[PDB]
Amino acid sequence: TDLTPFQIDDTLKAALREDVHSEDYSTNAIFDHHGQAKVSLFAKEAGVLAGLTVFQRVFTLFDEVTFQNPHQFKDGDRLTSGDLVLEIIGSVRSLLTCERVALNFLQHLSGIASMTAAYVEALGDDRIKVFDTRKTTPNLRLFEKYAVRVGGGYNHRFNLSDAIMLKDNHIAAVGSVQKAIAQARAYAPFVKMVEVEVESLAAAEEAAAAGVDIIMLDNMSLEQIEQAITLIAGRSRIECSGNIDMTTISRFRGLAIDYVSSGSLTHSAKSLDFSMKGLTYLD
Amino acid sequence: TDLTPFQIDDTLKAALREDVHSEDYSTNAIFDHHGQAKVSLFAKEAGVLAGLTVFQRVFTLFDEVTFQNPHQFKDGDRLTSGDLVLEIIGSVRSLLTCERVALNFLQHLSGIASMTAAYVEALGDDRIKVFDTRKTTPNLRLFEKYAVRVGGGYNHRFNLSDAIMLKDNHIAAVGSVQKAIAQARAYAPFVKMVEVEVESLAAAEEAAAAGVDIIMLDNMSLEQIEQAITLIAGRSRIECSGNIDMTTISRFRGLAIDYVSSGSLTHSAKSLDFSMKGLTYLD
Amino acid sequence: TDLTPFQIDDTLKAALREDVHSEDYSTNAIFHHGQAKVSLFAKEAGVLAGLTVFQRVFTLFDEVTFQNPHQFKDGDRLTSGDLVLEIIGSVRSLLTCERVALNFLQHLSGIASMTAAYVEALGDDRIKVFDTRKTTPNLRLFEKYAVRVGGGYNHRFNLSDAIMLKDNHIAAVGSVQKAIAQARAYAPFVKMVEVEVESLAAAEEAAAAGVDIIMLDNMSLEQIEQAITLIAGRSRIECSGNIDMTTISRFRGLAIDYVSSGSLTHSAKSLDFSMKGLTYLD
Amino acid sequence: TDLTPFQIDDTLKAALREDVHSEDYSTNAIFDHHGQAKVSLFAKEAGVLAGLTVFQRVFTLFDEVTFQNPHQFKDGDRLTSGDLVLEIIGSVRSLLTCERVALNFLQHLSGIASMTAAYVEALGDDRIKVFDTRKTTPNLRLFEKYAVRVGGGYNHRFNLSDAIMLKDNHIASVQKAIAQARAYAPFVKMVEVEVESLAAAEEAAAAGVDIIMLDNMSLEQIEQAITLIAGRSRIECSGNIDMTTISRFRGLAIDYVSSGSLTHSAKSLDFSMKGLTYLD
Amino acid sequence: TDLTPFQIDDTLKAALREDVHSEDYSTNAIFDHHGQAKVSLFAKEAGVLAGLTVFQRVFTLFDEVTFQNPHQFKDGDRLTSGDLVLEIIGSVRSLLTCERVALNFLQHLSGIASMTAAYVEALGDDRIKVFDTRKTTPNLRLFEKYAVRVGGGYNHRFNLSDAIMLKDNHIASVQKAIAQARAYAPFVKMVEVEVESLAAAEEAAAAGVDIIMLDNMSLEQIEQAITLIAGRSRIECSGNIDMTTISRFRGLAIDYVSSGSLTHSAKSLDFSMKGLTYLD
Amino acid sequence: TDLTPFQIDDTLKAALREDVHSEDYSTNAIFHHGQAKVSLFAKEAGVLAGLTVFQRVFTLFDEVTFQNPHQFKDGDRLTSGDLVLEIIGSVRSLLTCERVALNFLQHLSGIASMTAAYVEALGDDRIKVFDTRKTTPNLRLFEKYAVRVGGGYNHRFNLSDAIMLKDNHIAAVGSVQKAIAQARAYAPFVKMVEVEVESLAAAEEAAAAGVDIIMLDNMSLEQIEQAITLIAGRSRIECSGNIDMTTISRFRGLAIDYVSSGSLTHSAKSLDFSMKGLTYLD
């Protein structure tokens, strides 16, 4: 589901203002006469397209700009270098001044979508979902979460307010898996999912017995993981997390866990290369 | 030179608000009684430290929090996994709730500094500087620029307003390298540096003759580059750019150019791993 | 857990600015930067909520200290004539910062009091009283807090917190089970899913679909009872709609998990307080 | 006079942001390739309509949304349960995601207007006017003041900066207080004094103040004060005023009364949005 | 009465942001391991001091900065060139990066105060008062209004919402205009009317308005109007008022005059920050 | 190049809000949503600047159209009694949105006019007239524009735009050459570097150090002339300080690149306009 102007406008404005504090001298010195012009957006690298309407919105907040999409490209579609993703039509000053900010969004989000897509394939198991985390670029979580969905991934909680996750230390402070779970439930009844991070087979048992929604198996071995699965017997949903990357992710293939999660999808994504070229004046 | 609260506060607040829309239920359910506590910040990966005071400021905007720095770590210092970078002292709720946002800044910036440092070494020529670009994460340019300086790199223009750069299309619109340069100068006299992107040996000549400040040699071969240098004869500063990464950067070693620039330093930096662990209550 | 400056400061500042566009002429004309004391009195029985909010209004504006002779705190029961707080500072800060502070305190204490009253009227510990998103615009955080203070509980703060498939959602999709399926496909595992249901058939459909919470909307006791057995613990159960002081007792003793009321936040009478007894200080 | 985007937009945006921090998951999950949809706004309780354009603006900031108003309803009109106030047309996403915030405004403002209208009717004297106060919901004063006008009430000062009012501590020679106000103020502020005793009412009237407030002073007292003031100032009666009480002032020669409870503790008026159908 | 952080902070922050978009490169380039430094604020031109605490606040929002005031200067005090108004102590980075913004405020406000003071002296009659207008620099009205008070002037309405003023189009039966204002307004707004002819001045005074504005009406006219008005209203003379002109009103029984040029076209007053030295 | 809505809208809105806190009572009491026309007249000779700003104030507030009989634009010379614009819309929008619009227009036209006057007084094309950072807080953008409109040129907008090593910077470091060296080391290649210099010795030091721009601060003509030859085109030259209408002509014919004046922006008299001649429309 696409991102809306309500959601993105303030962020894009800020970004435009970051890149232009007075004016775009280089563009304004050369270009004048205010003729309409056309520029093309080209993919320069293979991957997955994400953030296209975000890209567009940067231009549209700045000036009156229209678009042409010859190949009907949309977020999710596979890209190959040289592909004509969009044509952008408007005044020269608007096209050149808005370009870098627009691309910066598009490159970043397409990079994440691409990487998410790659992880899914590397895993090669539909039955196991690929989830993101809170290890996101500050103030862009919304956009990054979106890119992950686009790439075929799924969203974990957005927030510390969304859902409860009882980590390593939380159990210790209470001194029982069961008590930590109980206090969580008492504190925020009914309307919050509760998850627990567990390093131990005993703790996984304790937690499943307590009736939690999701159990996180933290950096556990395959032997350990397999035992836990049988032990839990579908009493909770099972997430594997930690030390999960392109090389590692395939180890989970075929297990009866519900999902895995990776921070790298959002904290360490390479951006995907695009360029805007072929500027011509309209007749 | 370190980042100031005036510069970073609004951004960090926004980030905190992004991660906490109502409250941190998971932390609030388990922890109460408001005892002071101590937590340790550990490096988990080798590289360069950047964003330490940013990390700190996240806690300090939220609550009364103090720090201890046993090893006197500061931005720029080399890190090795297991290193104790900081101890953070304050109320448990403040420590756990602020953790992820604080780390997200620290990881991201240290990742950039590390990568910048790596590029500098790979180049192995002091006489040639490593510069960043405008291919930055929207609304964090300031922070990323800083991380590049920390890693031993240098800053290009911050902005479209900072300085003039006449790219591929700008020359064509005017139809002469010399005329584009002239119009730039006429438009913003004296107080703006002027740079031109050049793909051709002829154009490099034209530009040097015109008296520009900086000539950018775009994706040119070493043979081409070397000819241009001799041809320009120190009439302008020389930047090489395009297709510059870890593998490629060493090709510039020993040339009489002033600097090279890379977008990857900011658009495709891996974050550097840290963790906050060892939570204990103070006596 | 109390509200904090990080959470409340921008709101209180805005409120102060609303009440003082240039200066407080009437107070300034008569006054000194000469210390004074004023007393905060409860003028009506109920539950105290928003005391640190009240305090913060003064503290943002000027250097002001407080005395709390009776160690009053949010959640405590109030009776008229009670001395809740003494406020000490310059006369100008006290007079100018009075109306705004009280406006917060009166409003929140009103909500807490009303929440507390609903809980008692229900007279069943086993059934919790929840709030809603029918809140006063731009004060949700504060109102949600007041409900907790009065012994109530918080429903989702937001459209982003949890999924709730209401009448209008069901209509857009045209089916209960299909709407749940889509919600489940869209936000697996980490979001609770709730459905509003008007009929027993739909309650069945929903329970079978494996939702987390079923809302029984404005259903009769007979209906409710049937639904309970029929749902058979496959989901949590909430009752909602047409729930007020008179009505709430009807849920007493049922095997539902909670009830929810918009009135707690959209129609709460404010609780009366006054600030009086200005002594001068030396 | 209706409220404007210039006045309300920032507030509504903040309200929308309060209700949607990331996304509207429930609505986004049901997203489909359908076209535009229509939903109806129904009154569910009798009273007075206030905040209709505010209601509308919540949708219009968010997305492209149009309206149909079959019965030509406008702020000030009387409502009866089951009344079709508006039809809202636009994308399903916009209608459902904007609903609660829009209704929260409408319900709150219609509640105040209704209550104001009820107080007016209860007092029954057109000779008097019913005024509001500064006992308003923080950061919504502008909207609440509007609702009071809509319900047939009148606005007192918006602010501590609008006009001068002399209080208890301030009251502590009350002719000297008036003098200082007028002097300390430029000659562009109305001055009002709150008075408990008849002696003070006279001093004040002699002082040439603009408005004299008779505080919780009973009918005999009030009646004497009126005569004594002899039209030298405007007269406000205040304190201990409620639906039950307001009738005591019926027919007195005073100019107005004021009530905090109008904004202070107004019930919201019930509405609902239902009947979602896709357009053809 | 001095300005407050609650009033000024957002404005100053915006000003600082205007002057520093990324960083203060010039100052950061010279960063060293020195300690605290001291810099002096000097008056460089004679006039009246206004905006001193505003000046101070610019530094204090940014960083930890302290002040020393050897001569106990405060807003309203007369200045002579070479006067040491303040010493500013803090880190070099904070002093230099905050300087220009802080001075811009101080210079602007001291300029207005000075000009106001000059107008007062020029008119020479304490019986009259000198008032400002709404002809203010956008988004700084609050600060400019303050400076006018500091220079011995007085404040007219801050706003279109503060008070009522009847204009030319509005003037087009002028007793009916007054009636509608008072009716359309609640009984809490001062009403003023701008009048060109003596007939209108009388109608208005009879109407019981609070302030009558005699517009660009000359001394003979003015003098007749005064007598005719007979203290039924306050009298303002306005239009065609300047340093040269203001003296014509000396000794008339009018209450005040107003000038746009006070805020409209005030020269800023020169100051400088110099004498940077490191502390020991 | 004209100012734009993206650039100006938030400022104008703030300005409107400053002037109208609730409503325009005086205008509303008398009025219609009945169209009317008003004329904008120049009341004083000078240069027109800020016309589209003027227009935008109305356009943000309501639906308003304009007629420009004489095709006036920013930069054009004005003479009193000139009809600059006709404004058409509802009476309420015209009366309420009048003072703010004019305040912008008067201010900017004042700056443009003053800039234009300085250029003429200088009477040397070869020497440009620059502005400074001595601007009215929060209007720099607008003032910088007005200077260009009057035939002037813009200096750095910001502390972030370019490096300028002033008196106070030189003191902190204790040397001219060392300050330049540090600036050069800190921001190589992409930032211009300028130094303020009071003495010939320092001018030499600076030129030798290879700066981009030397500022000759409040120096005598004799000094200036010596400096020019001595600098020998190693840097651009700016003269600044104590530069006004009377003084500016002294620079005529020197081989300097430009002069700068704070007065253009900190001490500009506003240019008089009025809005009158309200016809009603049908």
Side-chain angles (χ1 to χ4, degrees), chain C residues 146-177 179-221:
Chain C
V147 170
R148 291 280 284 169
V149 174
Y153 291 82
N154 293 325
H155 208 308
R156 69 181 182 158
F157 269 61
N158 240 343
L159 292 170
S160 297
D161 264 352
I163 285 186
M164 193 183 308
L165 299 165
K166 318 187 167 273
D167 57 345
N168 284 338
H169 297 97
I170 290 138
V173 176
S175 173
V176 167
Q177 46 173 298
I180 298 165
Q182 294 193 290
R184 278 173 140 265
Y186 185 73
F189 316 146
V190 304
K191 296 280 181 248
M192 295 299 287
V193 174
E194 183 171 352
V195 179
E196 305 181 348
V197 177
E198 300 186 32
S199 72
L200 286 149
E204 163 69 51
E205 208 180 332
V211 297
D212 297 302
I213 307 177
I214 297 176
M215 182 190 281
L216 310 176
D217 195 69
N218 209 14
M219 289 188 11
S220 68
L221 297 177

Side-chain angles (χ1 to χ4, degrees), chain A residues 16-31 33-175 177 180-218 220-222 225-226:
Chain A
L16 278 174
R17 300 213 159 88
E18 184 185 50
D19 204 30
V20 190
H21 64 242
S22 62
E23 77 188 81
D24 179 11
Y25 294 101
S26 3
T27 292
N28 299 357
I30 306 313
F31 294 89
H33 105 72
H34 281 66
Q36 298 292 91
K38 177 156 74 47
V39 192
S40 293
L41 176 65
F42 288 105
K44 285 281 152 95
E45 184 177 357
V48 185
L49 173 69
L52 188 69
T53 71
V54 178
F55 171 89
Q56 292 183 246
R57 186 61 176 154
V58 174
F59 297 91
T60 288
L61 287 170
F62 194 85
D63 196 25
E64 285 220 34
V65 175
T66 57
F67 303 89
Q68 274 167 8
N69 194 343
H71 295 307
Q72 293 179 269
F73 268 105
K74 58 199 172 79
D75 280 3
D77 289 356
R78 284 218 206 88
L79 302 165
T80 301
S81 174
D83 283 3
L84 170 68
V85 178
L86 264 200
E87 281 163 334
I88 304 95
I89 292 95
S91 71
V92 173
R93 279 138 154 260
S94 312
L95 304 174
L96 302 189
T97 294
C98 288
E99 164 181 348
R100 176 38 48 209
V101 167
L103 286 171
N104 284 353
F105 277 99
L106 189 74
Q107 282 180 352
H108 178 75
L109 298 182
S110 291
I112 288 168
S114 292
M115 193 182 175
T116 299
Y119 271 47
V120 165
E121 179 149 32
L123 175 57
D125 191 351
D126 290 356
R127 292 163 299 184
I128 304 174
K129 290 169 171 65
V130 175
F131 273 65
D132 56 28
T133 63
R134 277 163 58 243
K135 301 190 188 190
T136 52
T137 305
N139 297 321
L140 297 174
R141 184 167 290 166
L142 186 71
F143 293 82
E144 297 185 337
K145 292 266 170 175
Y146 166 72
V148 170
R149 291 280 280 165
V150 175
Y154 291 79
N155 295 329
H156 210 305
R157 68 182 182 155
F158 199 75
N159 236 347
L160 292 171
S161 298
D162 259 351
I164 287 186
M165 195 182 307
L166 299 164
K167 318 188 164 273
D168 47 358
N169 44 5
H170 295 97
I171 293 139
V174 178
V177 160
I181 297 164
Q183 292 197 22
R185 302 272 201 213
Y187 186 74
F190 313 145
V191 301
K192 302 281 182 244
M193 292 298 200
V194 171
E195 182 169 353
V196 177
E197 305 182 349
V198 176
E199 299 189 27
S200 169
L201 278 300
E205 166 48 2
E206 209 179 334
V212 292
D213 298 303
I214 307 177
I215 298 176
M216 179 190 279
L217 308 176
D218 193 357
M220 287 187 12
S221 69
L222 296 177
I225 291 172
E226 212 94 52

Side-chain angles (χ1 to χ4, degrees), chain A residues 225-226 228-279:
Chain A
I225 291 172
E226 212 94 52
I229 293 189
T230 302
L231 179 64
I232 289 167
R235 279 128 80 207
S236 312
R237 296 286 179 193
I238 307 166
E239 161 177 12
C240 284
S241 180
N243 192 55
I244 295 175
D245 74 38
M246 271 292 256
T247 56
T248 312
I249 191 158
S250 57
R251 80 171 141 154
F252 304 95
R253 192 178 289 144
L255 313 181
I257 63 173
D258 301 283
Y259 66 106
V260 300
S261 67
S262 184
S264 303
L265 291 181
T266 51
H267 68 53
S268 291
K270 284 179 171 200
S271 53
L272 195 77
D273 197 17
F274 290 82
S275 85
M276 272 173 51
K277 257 148 192 166
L279 177 67

Side-chain angles (χ1 to χ4, degrees), chain A residues 1-7 9-10 13 142 155-156 158-159 162, chain D residues 13 16-17 20-25 28-29 31 61-63 93:
Chain A
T1 288
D2 219 333
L3 291 179
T4 70
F6 168 79
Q7 277 174 307
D9 279 14
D10 285 329
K13 284 192 239 201
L142 186 71
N155 295 329
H156 210 305
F158 199 75
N159 236 347
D162 259 351
Chain D
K13 283 192 238 201
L16 278 175
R17 301 223 168 266
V20 188
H21 176 72
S22 61
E23 77 189 78
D24 177 11
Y25 294 95
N28 288 346
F31 180 79
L61 288 169
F62 192 87
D63 196 27
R93 203 173 173 174

Side-chain angles (χ1 to χ4, degrees), chain F residues 33-42 44-62 64-66 68-70 72-76 78-85 87-90 93-177 179-250:
Chain F
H33 317 76
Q35 301 294 88
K37 172 223 281 175
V38 192
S39 293
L40 176 65
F41 289 104
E44 184 178 357
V47 184
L48 173 69
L51 188 69
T52 71
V53 179
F54 170 87
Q55 291 182 259
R56 187 58 179 159
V57 174
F58 297 95
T59 288
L60 288 171
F61 192 87
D62 202 41
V64 176
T65 58
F66 302 90
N68 196 344
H70 296 309
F72 270 105
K73 58 199 174 79
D74 281 2
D76 292 356
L78 300 165
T79 68
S80 179
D82 290 352
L83 170 68
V84 177
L85 264 199
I87 296 165
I88 294 94
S90 70
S93 306
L94 299 175
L95 278 64
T96 297
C97 286
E98 167 199 337
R99 172 40 48 214
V100 171
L102 283 172
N103 285 350
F104 277 100
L105 191 72
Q106 282 178 358
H107 181 74
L108 299 182
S109 292
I111 289 167
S113 292
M114 195 182 176
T115 300
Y118 273 48
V119 166
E120 177 153 28
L122 174 56
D124 191 351
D125 291 357
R126 293 163 300 182
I127 302 174
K128 289 169 171 67
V129 176
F130 273 65
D131 56 29
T132 62
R133 278 163 57 241
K134 303 190 188 189
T135 51
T136 305
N138 300 318
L139 296 174
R140 182 167 291 163
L141 185 72
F142 295 82
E143 296 186 336
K144 292 267 169 173
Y145 169 71
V147 170
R148 291 280 284 169
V149 174
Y153 291 82
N154 293 325
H155 208 308
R156 69 181 182 158
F157 269 61
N158 240 343
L159 292 170
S160 297
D161 264 352
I163 285 186
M164 193 183 308
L165 299 165
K166 318 187 167 273
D167 57 345
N168 284 338
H169 297 97
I170 290 138
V173 176
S175 173
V176 167
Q177 46 173 298
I180 298 165
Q182 294 193 290
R184 278 173 140 265
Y186 185 73
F189 316 146
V190 304
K191 296 280 181 248
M192 295 299 287
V193 174
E194 183 171 352
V195 179
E196 305 181 348
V197 177
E198 300 186 32
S199 72
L200 286 149
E204 163 69 51
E205 208 180 332
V211 297
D212 297 302
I213 307 177
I214 297 176
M215 182 190 281
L216 310 176
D217 195 69
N218 209 14
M219 289 188 11
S220 68
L221 297 177
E222 166 84 304
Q223 279 174 317
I224 289 173
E225 214 95 56
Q226 290 183 336
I228 292 182
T229 52
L230 181 60
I231 286 167
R234 281 128 88 206
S235 315
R236 297 281 185 198
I237 308 165
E238 161 176 12
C239 283
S240 177
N242 193 54
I243 294 175
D244 74 38
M245 272 293 256
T246 57
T247 313
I248 193 156
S249 56
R250 65 157 158 151

